[PDB]
Structure formats: structure tokens, C-alpha cells
Amino acid sequence: ANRATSAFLDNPHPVGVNYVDEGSRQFVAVAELLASKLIDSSRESDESNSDVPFVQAYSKFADDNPRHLRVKTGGKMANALTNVIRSYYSINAPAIVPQVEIDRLASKATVSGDMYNSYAIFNSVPIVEVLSPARTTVSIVGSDRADVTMLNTGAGAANITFNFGQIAETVILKGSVPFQLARLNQPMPAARFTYKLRPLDGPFIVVLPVGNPLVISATAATRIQVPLAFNKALVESGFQTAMNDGLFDIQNVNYYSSFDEFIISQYHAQDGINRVSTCVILGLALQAYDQMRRALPV
Amino acid sequence: ANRATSAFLDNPHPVGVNYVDEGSRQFVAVAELLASKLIDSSRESDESNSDVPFVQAYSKFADDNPRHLRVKTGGKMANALTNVIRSYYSINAPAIVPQVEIDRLASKATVSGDMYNSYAIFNSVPIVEVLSPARTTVSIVGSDRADVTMLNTGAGAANITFNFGQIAETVILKGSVPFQLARLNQPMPAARFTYKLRPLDGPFIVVLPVGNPLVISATAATRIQVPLAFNKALVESGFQTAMNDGLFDIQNVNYYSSFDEFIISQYHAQDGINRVSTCVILGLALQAYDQMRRALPVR
Amino acid sequence: ANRATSAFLDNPHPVGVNYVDEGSRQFVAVAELLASKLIDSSRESDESNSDVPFVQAYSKFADDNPRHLRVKTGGKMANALTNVIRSYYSINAPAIVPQVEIDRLASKATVSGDMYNSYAIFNSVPIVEVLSPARTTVSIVGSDRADVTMLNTGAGAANITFNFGQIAETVILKGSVPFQLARLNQPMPAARFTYKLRPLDGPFIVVLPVGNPLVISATAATRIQVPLAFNKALVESGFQTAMNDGLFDIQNVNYYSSFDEFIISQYHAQDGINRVSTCVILGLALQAYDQMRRALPV
Amino acid sequence: ANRATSAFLDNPHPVGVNYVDEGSRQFVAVAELLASKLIDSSRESDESNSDVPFVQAYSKFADDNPRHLRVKTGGKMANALTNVIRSYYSINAPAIVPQVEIDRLASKATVSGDMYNSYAIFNSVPIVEVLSPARTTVSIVGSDRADVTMLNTGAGAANITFNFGQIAETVILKGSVPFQLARLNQPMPAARFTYKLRPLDGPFIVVLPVGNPLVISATAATRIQVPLAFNKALVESGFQTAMNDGLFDIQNVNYYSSFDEFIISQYHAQDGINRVSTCVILGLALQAYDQMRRALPV
Amino acid sequence: MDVLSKGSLKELLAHLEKTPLEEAISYRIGTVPYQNVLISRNEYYNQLYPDTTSLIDGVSREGQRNVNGLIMSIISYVVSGSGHYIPNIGFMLLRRSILDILTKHDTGLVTNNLNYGIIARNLTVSKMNCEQRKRMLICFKLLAYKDGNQNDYEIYLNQNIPLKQIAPNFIPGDMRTVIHNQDQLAIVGIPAYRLTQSTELSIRDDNAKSYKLGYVDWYNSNSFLRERSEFNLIRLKDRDTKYGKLNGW
Amino acid sequence: KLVGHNYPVYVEPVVNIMNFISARFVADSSYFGYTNEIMIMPNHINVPVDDRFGFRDSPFCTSLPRTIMGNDVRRISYNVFSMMEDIDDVISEGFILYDAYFNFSYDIMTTDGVTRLKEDILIVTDTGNDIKPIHFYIYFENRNDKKLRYE
Amino acid sequence: DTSFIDTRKYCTDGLSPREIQKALNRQRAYYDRPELTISENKTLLSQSII
């Protein structure tokens, strides 16, 4: 037989185990709140023809008064935020910022570090295993939308097994031409364009006619608990900036195109439940990093 | 040896050279600020029993009081914004708005004309060229996510060169099956699924085994300086509206599926540093156009 | 017979003809004076423990008060100085800065744009031509200290002619081993290490014996009239800064290692006197640019 | 294949790791500021008939009053400045100065700036490797102006590979005779005298004809972030004084001719971005050492 | 001197309507252009300063006896203060205004075949300044709309980007555009800086400085019109009124 | 004209004298009664102090330490300190106030006694926190005095 | 304002921000909520500007 596996699900690296206590979560929540204040102060200062709103907002963030002949980089909070991002990504990171500094920075605002107030929908499509018989070719392309192209060069019809994992909630399959799909040991229905499947039901079997290649378009939605202040638009921008600025350039780690791929890949690992908690905290840390870097480019 | 290129990177048309001074930059920022206030005023008046907030907002924007039995176009500011958008897109578009009118409108609100306050990340992946031997075939499909399908019909393994340019900062390569990729004059590593590349490192060589086709998915991130008020969702929506409204209908101009493709194409051409500055101002103008037209729709 | 020439003396490109009049010359003098006050305002700020001296200096230079949310650029004078420098280098560069803007900026401080009230020494050694007979190799390396390597593979002694132009005031030649040099139609003296000569005297004949190579080092001094505010160290740094920033990036022009080579190469053109005046004004503009950009990096 | 590299680029020794924090950086700035006031006061005292400015300047610098019998050592500030210069050069240096003494001396004055406020241009040319075929010979000599002499004695034209690294901004190449240069795997242009290149463009190939040797002169410019009080003339002279006074005689260290060569060599190494930060601090310390010693020779 | 003092599109166009064509031409033979010459500049050098004669200097030069030469002389007068030597044109053409020659078909001159590339090349445009280029582009625009060559004018501007950036924005048939225009077209005026009585090396700069110092003398002379003091003495025809507009516009 | 004046070459001596005194005022602030940094600590933390003068519980340090008992000392600017809310918990450990000019006065009493401040260190308003005027009642020390040690 | 960082102008026209602060201040007292903070007070009292 043959096996095809989604590219982004291959060997997720272990995440960090530091800065996960209640104090560190408050620090990440505090940083996100004060980073948002920096963006708004810059707008308000621009509309008021004065610099006082930005100076006061930067003083809370950096614990230092701005000066005309000094470089503004965010101060101590910017350094600690950068270091905790490095620690979260890999277990081989040094994790240098001390605990006393974390508590000092976490006391600036009174925000509860609750990471399970709300939820978010992630659109990565998990294809753990596609099993095909001999003399058939199957290729998987895409992460947000998975395009599975199968060609049957055999004499008769072929049976292909799809395994979508047991984590995603709903998967919707659309084919170029109508095709047949059914569960294990179930009757095959008439050919249809669209199928809605629950991955917990079991492996699904598709029938490949010998005539022409068939392409199946897969879209999936998964629910992950996140804090209320989670914004996927800000998180995705923060992920790219952190990768560009070399916060993930530690040896023996995997690189992902987006944050949705990152969180889904570690969700499917053996200890995925414990990994997702750390990944969510990194998402809020990445959200704070994006706003702070946009208000204070370097 | 055959060459393969991205569709959106070809023949970038020249962009406008007018309305790029400090006074003109203030007008676009003022228009964006006043357009946003118009949206919030309409929502506030709809939720209340009085039309006073919308009357004040529209009067400031249009310089005339709103009237029943009238189309509520937007006034002189709407006309100036529409014609300014035309000028930025193409160098063949006329510049008809007087500078005195632009200066008058820029005095309605107080904002800086800073177009370099902050940065934004654009996701279009530039594949400048793919060089393949004679036996193989390569097809490049996609703009936001570029899929390159690679087929080796020859007797032995082939070497194909990927050139992503020098503008993009990071490029992530993900393959359907594990493959090998390394720089020029470097040893090939073990076959692995994903690669992270800095496009400045140089052309990249990928070994193509004989057999089933290999598809590589590429995603790239690029940083372009933008004003702090920049909002990507609003810019992209405004880009489609202007194209639908015919503001981009002019002779000898290329067309793009999104604003991401437009700005990256101009960045990769000669004088790209000079062209992106005008494109950013057009982006902020499109942000104002979306807010202003959604608040006051016209036929 | 082969001939050799200095690399930097080949094909000087035409220089700009705009921004040479009295008002534009006074704009460059004002820009230099005000940019100098910008640098000294930093030391005043250190002593005064406050940014007020810097704010005063920048307000006069830019007509606008400094902001904390904006990167300090210099405003109109910075834009005017940058564009004016571009026009000086090449005749193909546009003259974008209006006259009215130049007059307004020239009225900020009281100066006289006299560029002929002092002099400077320029050390680029001009070797217009070196004529050698057959079976003789001549290589010219260097621009500030030119080393000429001479090898005679022939049977007898060879006569090699030097032409140092008609512009340089003095040239001092120091050989690896004592050698003989004399003017045309003059007898040769005893072998000496060092010769001091005036290029205006005429072409010089040097006797090359057969054997080991003879290397001659040439150092020259030229006097060019410059304004009293001229400073060679600041001008040289400004030349490198402008080249890095791309102010000289324009089609159909030549590129020089230093301002010393640029001005001497232009002086040795077909009509080099016409271009010396413009080159000196470019020097003062570059001196203003180096001070302005070091205080306000961008 | 033959490989030739610049001498000063070979094996940069590790740089010291102490006295690089915010407090220690403030001490170097204060020492530079106080030393500048010392040399300026010494000149005024010599010009005038009374010694008041020197007495006050030395009292502030040395925390004691000058005496006609005792020698002017410079006080504890001179002692601390000497020892930190030793520590900055190599990691094998003792670095036994207490940090409390550094903070005490840093409180004498206050500085309105940092070590990243401005920039400086460094003229050393990095030639990482020059690759040549079997028959050609290449020799690289020079640091301020590299001179590459290549000779071809084979059957036909050869290709020489030039690697200028990725750090330098612009490199200007001049040749004794016109030559062809192009980027890797690109068509060659017609022969010219001078080329302007961006080292990040890639390795450059030079066509070497058979016959008389070709000498290429290279000049490069690099930009490094420095404090606004940086002065290359004072730093370079301070570098020579430190070497003569034997502040750099440590085992297993490399010796450089100029501070320009030292900073470029450290920059062109793994983790060179972190090394230039300490080299800039050392450069400013050498500026204080120069001014202090010229006012108080021992 | 009077033409070079106009600072707005309104004043410049009004002056061209009043003045006749004979002011644009000169009756002094002068010399020929594009000639390498050695001139004497003793305040700076002892030797002779090299330079090149052009059509943009303020000195009269011999010109070609064709329509191309006539247009070059008109633009030279506008951007330099003096014209060329084209005699025996005819009294019918010499009586008409400069504006009428540029934008009216009734004069009888045929200018359709004129090419803007060589005219800009001959009237050396790489040696002009920003104010000089703007005035030349005004003349090109007026001519283009006279013969219906607006499309050719646009293509020429699109080829040369710097010219497009500084090109004045006005429609030759509409007076509202002239009023709204706020370009600065003055080559001489009262200087904010310190203007001294010293020579300049180039022929163009020396002649331009002579016009500048001449305007200061004329500004302070009795021929200047001080509006704040004697506005009631001007006739009603030539008094400044907002209703006033160019004929046919 | 006032701010754009250029100093003449023959500056009158009075201008130099005033420039000298002004420079010494900014540079050597301790001679005139003001400083730039102060430290506020509880009484159960013992910090090394300048013991040359023999004062009892001397409020004078040779330099304000960056570490005490091997622990880094918090540094807060006056601006952040003004807007701080949990000032009672912060003062439970030490902190250093800077970015402001602090005026102090002191009387050296010949007799022995308990060194103390005239008024309380902190004041809180709804607008922000502030430091009350600093006045020292410095007394000389006799180590064997048990009553003053207890007090 | 007395703060050295604040160089803004506080308008004395319109309904005084102090009156709104007192009204908000009393509302929190009823709900047994913490009083308005110094940073929250400064933002409210600086709403009226010229």
C-alpha cells in the first residue's frame, strides 16, 4: 500500500515548560493590555497635536521617560516579552528572564490571566493518513484547504481510506466530480459533490473510478479555548514578525507557515492537550509583540 | 533550460507621480479619519432617536447639510478622493483636482501625514524564476500560496533552481513528500518535509527524483512601512470596490487580484523603493473609500 | 609601445549646472551652519540635563518642533539638501527644488556664500599617461599614493616617459632603489632615491635598467580654492554616507572611492575649471549632510 | 582551487563579556565627557596665565586636587578606565574592578544619549575568500585599500571568484587595466575601469586574461551604530596609545593595526552582531583614554 | 525683466496678452549658439573661463528663419528675458500678441509639425531650473491645445517623469484653472537672502544675476506701481478686478 | 535674537563668572542641597552607610547601591511612582527614586539622639503620590548607649 | 496640570470632568467596587483639552 500524510503534521517539536504559572500568565495578559494602549495613544496623540498621550503610555510600558536623543525600544517589558516567546517555542530555549522580574511587570495592571474565557475556530485541515492501494497515486497539497488528488491507473475501482484524526470537529469535502464516500462496513450512497463528516466517526472510504483523476477539497474547523482578548488577525501578524526577527531560530525545531498550523500540529501529538495550553499563551504573547513592534518599530 | 515565473510579477505598470507631497498626504489621512467618524456617527444615530450626530458628521465631510430627496453623494471630498485614487494607480490617468482644493480639505481635521510610522506584513510569495532542465516540467500556480508541481520524466535525478528575489524576508517551503534542498555549492541534507529560507541566501537547488510528481507549497512574508492607521482588511475591501467601480479602468495597465499582489509587484521592479511609497498612499486612500462608500452608497 | 593611465582619471562624467548662483550657495552655507549647531546641541543637552537645547536646534533646522511619535527627519531643509546634492553629481539628475524654497531657507541665518576665500590641499596623484617601449611592463596601482611597477625584460636600458598633467602643483617620487630621472632634452643626474618636480615643467624620462623590477611611489599636492568653512574630514565622511544612501545612484555616471579622486578627476577633464566650482559646492553640501544625518539617522 | 583571504579577517579572538550593562555603559560616557573637559581646560590654562580651569577639571576627574610634587595619575577614574579597556579586548583579561566603584564613578555626571544614537563609517575592506583555478596566482595585500594582484599563466582565460561578505554596504573596485566582472551565473559586460557593487548581491566573477598581471584595488564602506560623541580620529589615536602602553598584551589574542580593522574583523564572525556592541564601548573608552593621557602624560 | 517678474499663471498670461511679438524678437545680430568659448572672469581667475553659448542666455543670438526658430525665440524670451534675431517676419505677425501667436489659429502661423523633443533639446532643458522648465511647459501646453495635440503633449510628459512632476495644471480654454493655480513662476524678485554686486562664472548665471539686480533697481525706481499708495490713480480699464478674465477664455 | 545670539570673542568677565557658577550648580549638586536619586527602605534592612562622620544611623551612602544583600534594588522613576497604586506593598521593600530633583536639608546636633526625619516620607492624593519635604535631624553616636539603640 | 510631563491645556468650558468623576466615584461606592485609580482619574480629567 501507500501512505500520504499532511506536511505540517510531521514531528512537532516539544514546547517549553517555563512561564506557565499563574504569575507568568498575568504578565502576558498585562503586556497585551499595555501594548494595545500604546497603539491607541499614538492615534490619540496624533489627533490632538500633542505627544502627552504617547509619552504617558510609553512610560507605563517601558518604566522610562522618552528622550529625544535616546532609542525607544520598549524598555524592560519588551526584553522579557521577547525572551518568553523564545522559551515558549522550544524546550531547548534558555529561559533567562527571572521570576522576580515577571512579578514586577505583572503588577502594572489588574487583569486576570484566564486562558479559558472564550474559544476560537482554527481552519487547519488535519490529514493524518491517506491509505491507497497499489498502482494508484495520491498527493496532498495545502494546509488551510487540503487538495487531495488521486489517479487510478488500475483495471478496476479502487478504495482509499481517509483518516482525519479524532480532534477536529467537522470536515467538509467537495470534489471536482461527484464521488462516493462511506464509513467502514457501511453501504455506499449515490455520487454527491459535498460531504459533511465528523472525524470521530471513523475512517472513511472513497471509491475511485478508473476514468479521470478526482480532486477532493477538504476544509476543517477545530475549537480551542483561548482568552477573551484573543484576536486571530493580530496573532497571525505577530507570528510572522517573530519568525522574521529570528525569535524561532533555535536548533532542532520545526517551522510552520501560520499559527493555525502550529497549534493544530501540536494538538495531534501524544501530549497535545498539555501542549495546547502553552501554545495558546504563546498566541497571546505574540499578539502583544505585534502591537508593541508596530507602535515602536526598531 | 526552461524558465517559470509568477503571473502577478510580470510587467508592473508605472504608478502615478502626482499628489505625493506632504499636503496631499495630509488630505488622504484627513479623509480616512473623517470617513471613519462618518461610519460611527451613522451607527450612533441609527441606535438613537435623533439624526443630529449624522447631520454634523456629514456636514463636516461634505460641506453641505444632508437633505431629504437628495442622493447624499459625499460632496467635494468624495470627488477629490475618487479622482486622487485614479491618479495613484496609473501614470496615464489625468490629474484634475486643484492643489488649492486638496489643501482646503486637508484643513478639516488635524492629523500627521506620516506614511512611515509603522509596518505591515504582506503575504504574496515572489517566485522570480524557476530554472529546470530539459527533461522536466514545472508549473507554478497561486499567489498567496504558491504551489509548484515538479515532474521528472528523465532517466536520472534533476536539479531545479529556485530564485525568490531579495525583497522578501522569509520563505517557508513545504513539500507533498520529503525532498532535498540546499544552497549553491552546499551539501544536500537528509530529505525533510519543511524548509525555512532567507531569500537573500541565494538561489536554492532542489533534487527531483524520478517517479511521482513533487509539489512544493511556498509562503512568504514581506515587511512594508505603512502609516499606523493602516488596516489590511479595509484596504483589501476598498481595492475590490474601486476595481468594480471602474476607478482602475485606463489604458495599458496590469490588473491584480488583490492589493497584496499589487504592492509586491511594484516592489520587485526597478525603482521599487520609490514605487511602494506611492502604493502605500493609495492603500490609505482605498481605506477611506471603503468607509465613505459603505456609509453613503451610490449607484 | 604601450601606455598606462590612472584608473580614476578615466571618463569624468558631466556635473550639474543648477544650484550654483548666490542664493543657492547661501542655502548650502546656512545648511552647514545649522547642521553644525545640531551636533553641538547634543553636548549641550548632556551638560544641561535636558533636551531643550536639542529641541531649539532642530526647530530652527526643520521649522517644526520634534515629536516623540515621529522619526526626526529634518523637514524641508533635509529634503532640500538631499535633492540638491543629487543635482550636483550629474547633469542627468533633475532639479526638483524650487528657487523660492531655496531663498526662504537661505534667509534663516546670515552667511555669505563666498567659495573662494580659502584653499585646501588635495592629495590625488594624477598620472595622465606613462609611455613605455616594447619588452617593458608598467602597472599603475593606487590613487592617493600611486605605485608604478616597472620591469625591463629587454637586452638594454629603456626610457619611460611620465606625464603628470598641468594642474598638480608638486609631485614627489620615491623609488624602491635609486634611479635616474630627468626632463626632456636634459642630461641625467646620479641615481637618487627621491625627486621633487613640478608637473608644469614637462614630461619626465626615467631610465629603467635591466634586472629586478623598479617601483616608484608618487605623492602629489594640489591647491583648490574652497570656502573657509570647508573641512576635509567631514566632506570625506559625507561622500561615503551619500554613496551608501544612493544619492549618487543615477545612470551614465562614474563612481569614485573618495571626494579627493572626484574633484581631481573633474579638474583634469577637457575644461576642468568649469567643474571645480560645482564640485567644491558639492563638498560643502556633503559636509552639511554628514552632520545632519549623524544627528538624525534614518 | 586556491583560497586567499585578508590577513586581518583571520580568527577574531573572543571579546570580553563584563562591563557591558547599562550602568557600565554610563560610566564610559561619563569618562569620555569628563576627559574632554580636561583636555579643553588644559589648553585654556596654557593659553592663559592662570591654572583655574585645569584645577577644577582635574578635581572633578580624579576626586582630588592637583599637587606640584605628586604626579598627576588621573585618580581612581584613570585606574578604572585602564582596567576596563583591558577587559574589553579579550575574555582572558582579569576584569577585577568592582561594580560598585563603576557605579560611583558613573554618578559624577549625567549623559543625554546612548550607544545607538548615531552611526560611523569604517573603511576596511572585507575579502572573505578569493577562489582561483590551478594555474593562476592571487595575492591580497592591504586593509584600508586592498590590492589584489592576479596573474594567469595557463592556456586560456580563467575565472576568479570574489567574496566580500554580507556586512559591508558598498565596495568600489578599480583596476589597473579595464576588466570584466559580473555576478554568479550572469552574462559578462564589456570591460570597464571602475565597478560599484553591493556585497549582498552575491559572489562576483572576474575574467582574467592571459598576459600581463591585473591588479584590482578595492575600497569598502561599512556602517556601524555608535554614540553621537564618537570621533574616529580620537579613537584611532587612542587605539595606538593603548597598544604602546601594553593594555592589550594578553595570551592567545590577535593584534590589529587599526581600530577600523579590529571592529570589522569582529563583525565578520559568528555572533558578530553581539561583538560589535562591546567593540563600540571599547572604542568610546579609547576616546577617553586618548584625551586623558594627552592632558596627563606619565 | 518685466516678463521674468511674473509670479503666477494669471500675471504671466496677462502680460503675454498685452505684449506684442516684436518684444520676443531682437534686432541685434549677436553671435551663434552651441559654440565653445573662452570668457574673462577676473574676479575669480586670471586665465579665461571656458563656457558654451546657448539659446537660454539673456544675450541676443542669431536664429533660424522658420517657424521652429520663431517658437524657440518666444520661449527664450519667456524663460530668459531676451529673444533671437529673426528679421523680416512681417508687420502682420509682429503686431499680434505673444498669447495670440501661441493659442489662436487666426494669426496664420502653422505650428502643427513642431516636435517637443528637439525644441526642448535645442532650448537646452538639462541646463534650465525649475521655474524655467515650468514656463516652457506652459508654452508647450498652449501650443498643443492650439493645434489639437493634447494626446501628444501627455505622451511626451509621460516619457519624461521629472517634467510631469512639475508640469502646471491648467486647461488653456478655461479661466477658472488659471485662477486656482498656485505655481511660483518668478525668476526675479525681491530676495530674502543677501544679494550682492558680484559676478558669476557661467554665462547663464551672470546674465540672470544682472536681471535680478536690475529688478531691484526697477523695484525702487519711479516706474514701479505701488498699489497700496496710488491705487486710485490707475485707470479703470487696467485696475485689478476679480471679474477680469483673458479674452476668449 | 535672545536665543540666536552668538557669543563675542571678547566676552565680558561677568558672563564667564555666571557661566562657571551655573555649570557648578548643575554638575556638583550636593554642594547646594539637591540630588537626583533617593532610597526609601524599611528599618529592618541594614545597608552599609558612610560611617566616616560617626553619625547615628547615618542617612548618607557613598553611592546608592545597585544590590543589597545580594539582591537587586528596584529603581522607579518619579513619573511611574506618582501613578503607582500599590505603593504600600512596594515600600515594604526598598526602591530608588530618580528622574527628579530632590531637595534636602539637615541639622547636625552635637548631642546624641535618635536620627530621624521631620515629617512622614509619603503623601497620596487622588491625582498621584508625592514625597514630602526632606529634613534630617542627625545626631552623633555613642555605641554603648542601650536606650538610644532600642529607640 | 502640576505634572512636569504634562504640557497639555485643560479646557474650563463645558461640563466639568470633575463632576463626572464625582458621579462615577459615588456609583462605585454603592457597588462596593474599588475607587477610580490615579491613571483612570488622569485620563478622565484630561478629556477636555484645547
- Phi/psi of residue C214, each to 5°? -110, 125
Q: How many residues does chain E have?
A: 249
- Phi/psi of residue B27, each to 5°? -65, -40
Q: Per the structure block, which three cell numbers stand in for D160?
A: 576568479
Q: Among partner residues E154, E165, E169, which is closest to B98 by beta-carbon distance? A: E169
Record: contact D23-F27, CB cut-off 8 A: no
Instruction: Identify the residue whose cell numbers are 525668476.
Output: E187
Record: contact F77-A59, CB cut-off 8 A: yes
Q: Is B27 helix (H, G, I), strand (E, B) or coil?
A: helix
Chain A residues whose CB is inside 8 A of the F77 CB are 59, 63-65
Beta bridge mates, F102: F35
Closest CA to C248 of A145, D249, A188, D196: D196
* Cβ A40 vs Cβ C23: under 8 Å: no
Record: contact C47-F3, CB cut-off 8 A: no
Record: contact C20-E202, CB cut-off 8 A: yes
| Alpha-helix residue ranges (DSSP H) falling in C169-218 | none
C49 touches chain F (CB under 8 A): yes
Which chains form contacts with chain B, at 3 or more CB pairs under 8 Å?
A: A, C, D, E
Type of residue found at E201: L
Residues of F with CB under 8 A from a CB of C: 3-4, 23, 26-27
Residue D37's contacts (CB-CB under 8 Å, 6 or more residues apart) are: D57, D60, D61
Chain A residues whose CB is inside 8 A of the B228 CB are 39, 42-43, 46, 294-295
- Nearest Cα residue in chain A from F75: A63
| Alpha-helix residue ranges (DSSP H) falling in E47-183 | 67-80, 91-95, 98-103, 116-122, 130-146, 150-159, 161-165, 175-180
CA distance C292 to C38: 7
Closest CA to C60 of C101, C107, C14, C103: C107
Rounded to a whole number of angstroms, the distance from the CA of D185 to the nearest CA of chain B is 10
CA E27 to chain centre: 18
* CB-based burial label for F134 (10 Å; 0-12, 13-18, 19+): middle
Chains F and E touch (3+ CB pairs under 8 A): no
* Cβ A291 vs Cβ A36: under 8 Å: yes
Q: Is F117 helix (H, G, I), strand (E, B) or coil?
A: strand
Give the C-alpha distances (Å, rounded to integers) separating A264 from A218, A261, B221: 15, 5, 21
Which chains form contacts with chain A, at 3 or more CB pairs under 8 Å?
A: B, C, D, F, G
Residue B69's contacts (CB-CB under 8 Å, 6 or more residues apart) are: none
Residue C60's contacts (CB-CB under 8 Å, 6 or more residues apart) are: C34, C37, C108, F4
D202 touches chain B (CB under 8 A): yes
Rounded to a whole number of angstroms, the distance from the CA of D294 to the nearest CA of chain A is 29
Beta bridge mates, D139: D149
- Nearest Cα residue in chain C from D179: C7
Record: contact D221-C233, CB cut-off 8 A: no
Closest CA to B196 of A143, A251, A127, A146: A251
Q: Among partner residues C45, C51, C69, which is closest to A51 by beta-carbon distance? A: C69
* CB-based burial label for B126 (10 Å; 0-12, 13-18, 19+): buried
Record: contact A68-C66, CB cut-off 8 A: yes
* CB-facing half-sphere around the CA of B192: CA atoms within 13 A: 16
| F74-77 and F95-98 beta bridge pairing | parallel
CA C108 to chain centre: 28
Q: What is the DSSP letter of G49?
A: B
CA distance B161 to E30: 67
Record: contact G5-A48, CB cut-off 8 A: no
The experimental method, as deposited, was cryo-EM
Record: contact G38-F82, CB cut-off 8 A: yes
Angle value at C-alpha F33, between F27 and F34, nearest 5 degrees:
60
Q: Per the structure block, which three cell numbers stand in for C89?
A: 553629481
Chain B and chain D share a number of CB contacts under 8 A equal to 6
| Alpha-helix residue ranges (DSSP H) falling in chain D | 22-47, 52-62, 75-89, 99-106, 232-244, 259-267, 272-295
Closest CA to C225 of C115, C113, C114: C115
* Cβ D166 vs Cβ D200: under 8 Å: yes
* Cβ A87 vs Cβ A6: under 8 Å: no
CA A170 to chain centre: 18
D270 touches chain A (CB under 8 A): no
- Phi/psi of residue B38, each to 5°? -65, -40
Rounded to a whole number of angstroms, the distance from the CA of B278 to the nearest CA of chain E is 13
* Cβ A177 vs Cβ A214: under 8 Å: yes
A66 touches chain C (CB under 8 A): yes
Angle value at C-alpha B253, between B248 and B259, nearest 5 degrees:
60
CA distance D119 to B200: 24
CA distance A99 to A97: 7
Beta bridge mates, B220: B171
* CB-based burial label for B189 (10 Å; 0-12, 13-18, 19+): exposed
* Cβ B282 vs Cβ B88: under 8 Å: yes
Q: Which residues in chain G precede a discontinuity of more than 2.5 Å between C and N?
A: none
* Cβ A152 vs Cβ A208: under 8 Å: yes
- Phi/psi of residue B223, each to 5°? -110, 120
CA distance C64 to A65: 22
Q: Among partner residues B184, B200, B203, which is closest to D200 by beta-carbon distance? A: B200
CA distance E31 to E53: 9
Closest CA to E74 of E131, E135, E118: E135
Closest CA to B144 of B237, B239, B267, B7: B7
Chain B interface, mutation test: which of A45, A51, A244, most B Cβ atoms within 10 Å? Answer: A244
Closest CA to C169 of C135, C123, C209: C123
Rounded to a whole number of angstroms, the distance from the CA of B5 to the nearest CA of chain C is 28
Q: Per the structure block, which three cell numbers stand in for C296?
A: 538624525
A37 touches chain B (CB under 8 A): no
- Nearest Cα residue in chain D from A71: D117
Closest CA to A227 of A29, A15, A7, A1: A29
* CB-based burial label for E232 (10 Å; 0-12, 13-18, 19+): exposed
Chain D residues whose CB is inside 8 A of the C140 CB are 176
Chains A and B touch (3+ CB pairs under 8 A): yes
CA distance A266 to C258: 57
C127: number of Cβ within 10 Å: 24
Which chains form contacts with chain E, at 3 or more CB pairs under 8 Å?
A: B, C
Chain G residues whose CB is inside 8 A of the F127 CB are 2, 38, 41-42
Rounded to a whole number of angstroms, the distance from the CA of C252 to the nearest CA of chain D is 13
End-to-end CA distance of chain D: 53
Segment holding D204, helix H or strand E: strand D204-208
* Cβ B10 vs Cβ B145: under 8 Å: no
User: Torsion over CA of E130, E131, E133 and E137, rounded to 10 degrees?
Assistant: 130
D57: number of Cβ within 10 Å: 23
- Nearest Cα residue in chain C from B117: C70
The residues in B 213-232 lying below 8 A from D, measured between CB atoms, are none
C56 touches chain F (CB under 8 A): yes
Q: Per the structure block, which three cell numbers stand in for F130?
A: 508625592
- What is the dihedral sign for C-alpha C260, C265, C268, C274? negative
CA distance A98 to A108: 17
Q: What is the DSSP letter of D89?
A: H
Closest CA to A98 of A203, A153, A23: A23
Beta bridge mates, C195: C173
Beta bridge mates, C192: C179
Record: contact E169-B95, CB cut-off 8 A: yes
Beta bridge mates, D196: D172
- Nearest Cα residue in chain C from A52: C68
A246 touches chain B (CB under 8 A): no
| Alpha-helix residue ranges (DSSP H) falling in chain E | 9-18, 67-80, 91-95, 98-103, 116-122, 130-146, 150-159, 161-165, 175-180, 203-219, 227-230
The residues in A 53-112 lying below 8 A from G, measured between CB atoms, are 55-56, 59-60, 65
